[PDB]
Amino acid sequence: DAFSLSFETNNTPRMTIDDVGRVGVGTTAPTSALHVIGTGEVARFVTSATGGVVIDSTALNYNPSLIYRKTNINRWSMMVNAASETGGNAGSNLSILRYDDTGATLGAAVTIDRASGFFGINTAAPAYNIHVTGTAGLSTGSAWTVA
Amino acid sequence: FSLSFETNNTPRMTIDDVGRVGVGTTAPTSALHVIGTGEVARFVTSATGGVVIDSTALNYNPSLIYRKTNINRWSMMVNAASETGGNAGSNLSILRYDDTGATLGAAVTIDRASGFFGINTAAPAYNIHVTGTAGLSTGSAWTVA
């Protein structure tokens, strides 16, 4: 059961609040606490100072995430991962996850260590400023340029 | 033609007849349009999860777009590469935009099927694939990990 706000201009429901507390904008069947449907620019968050959007969790073992889906199937995500915060800025590292065609996790393409800033490619625990598990290709030669 | 909820005789939320909802604006330009100072929107999860950007079809591409004065500057999006099977297609791209908001191309492309990370490379064929130069402050070779 749901509550809806409509306009006699189109008779179409514009906002819906169901009995479990979910709010739909453009849907009468929201599947999230806030569920918005649109065309192109769905949501716009404007800050008149430095800032913007915050994704937060209620506990250190709950991991905030931004998830990209197509037809509501996981494709990519950027998230703070589950590495334990044991002190000294350990844990809660940044990860870009890739998902298969059915939405199952394939792996972490990128993991940035919070304590060191080390950038890992296919490496969940990078041990150098850049750390690659696998192959490396450069179009202009075989060497780094000494910067 | 729209409805506004007011507190302190000021409109706080507005719903128009086209279905757009504004928080802090009486003239929303998107389905949800929020204005604030600093932390504009906060999404708090009591489990692992958060915010989902979704599309209604495989050929519609979900994106997070960063603008300044409503001009495109950067974006992180799932691109239009066709999903031909075996996890092909729908790769991740970080796009840069010029001062007028026109695309300058993908600075980074990550392949979904392999995880390969391409810098200035649309079709990475190595775990890291760079088109151009590579600078390292400490020497010219990799350390064998």
Next chain:
Amino acid sequence: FSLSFETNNTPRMTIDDVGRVGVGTTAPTSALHVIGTGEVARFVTSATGGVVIDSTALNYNPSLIYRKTNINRWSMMVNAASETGGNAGSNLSILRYDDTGATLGAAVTIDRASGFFGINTAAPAYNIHVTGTAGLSTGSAWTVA
């Protein structure tokens, strides 16, 4: 003062006296403040598009911020480098934060004018530019691609 829309017997949406909107909380701390379990917010586009983070001036930085227990952990933002022409300025940065939420600096900086990808490097001068060490599991050299 605040108004809440109540269903069953529970407040679901709240508008307080300063104009902040809470969904799942009667004490919103930002313009829009949403509480949920797992799937907190879902933004669905029936075309190519999605979510826009925008600022009202070039010196204001739009940001996506990841927190745990409301303490900064990571952020991805467009920085305040001056837009002096030729697509200079407004570069992309990924910032890391310590356990108390204080900034530890930019782990990654992508230059908008060139696309150059800097790791621990504020001004990348190569297509990839690393300040520090480099580790590769398969050898000490790049493969010529």
